[PDB]
């Protein structure tokens, strides 16, 4: 239950994730607004047999920004790694792609980084 | 005079560059609009002693999107490599950062890629 649990990023968004035995990541991403309308499905994958040399555990997930309340016609992927132990953390870089026409494709993709910290038991 | 010259990207923008003996890149970036208002200063650096194993020549440059006609309060960096020979090409990835307030920082940085092809002599 290293990855599985509740995580928060630097802005107050929440990453509620289950890491399945088969490499699956499933769960819910909650924006910092924190209401029902702020909850989105996430799905991804992780390395279920990481190195034992002190390296982190590689992972990624996607949120499509549609739920039953709203649709921002866009999807974000986070690519990163889990670093366990003292102050467990998931360090990520992300790509947010919005649907665009071809002539607006230069405006399509935002990039950034997020660090998530886990709620301790 | 491998890098030095006139290059065009996939959209019809122009990269007019001089590669100096000291590693300097200087020149003008011209948007696809192609008028006076479309010309911006660029400055950057390149590897002036690349490997001789078939690898490309690493380089990068910056345009701040201000000229005497307009200011988009933003800057783009292109990071890439020059590949000489048949069909000389500069393959790049770019980051466009706009000035934002702190609360809008997630909207600050666009990412993309451009391939430039050189005008032959």
């Amino acid at each position: 239950a290293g990855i599985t649990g509740t995580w928060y990023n630097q802005l107050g968004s929440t990453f509620i994730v289950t890491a399945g035995a088969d490499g699956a990541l499933t769960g819910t991403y909650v924006t910092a607004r924190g209401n029902a309308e702020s909850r989105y499905v996430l799905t991804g994958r992780y390395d279920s047999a990481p190195a034992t040399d002190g390296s982190g555990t590689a992972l990624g997930w996607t949120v499509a920004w549609k739920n039953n309340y709203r649709n921002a016609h866009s999807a974000t992927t986070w690519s990163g790694q889990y670093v366990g132990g003292a102050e467990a953390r998931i360090n990520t870089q992300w790509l947010l792609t919005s649907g665009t026409t071809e002539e607006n494709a230069g405006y399509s993709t935002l990039v950034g980084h997020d660090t998530f910290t886990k709620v301790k038991p | 005079a491998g890098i030095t010259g006139t290059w065009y990207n996939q959209l019809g923008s122009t990269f007019i560059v001089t590669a100096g003996a000291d590693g300097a890149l200087t020149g003008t970036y011209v948007t696809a609009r192609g008028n006076a208002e479309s010309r911006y200063v660029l400055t950057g650096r390149y590897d002036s002693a690349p490997a001789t194993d078939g690898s490309g020549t690493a380089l990068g440059w910056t345009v701040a999107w201000k000229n005497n006609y307009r200011n988009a309060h933003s800057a783009t960096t292109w990071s890439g490599q020059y590949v000489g020979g048949a069909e000389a090409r500069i393959n790049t990835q770019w980051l466009l950062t706009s000035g934002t307030t702190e609360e809008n920082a997630g909207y600050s940085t666009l990412v993309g890629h451009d391939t430039f092809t050189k005008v032959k002599p």
Partner: peptide, 8 residues
């Protein structure tokens, strides 16, 4: 115009 990822 605002995006849910960055909303407060």
């Amino acid at each position: 115009w605002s995006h849910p990822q960055f909303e407060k």
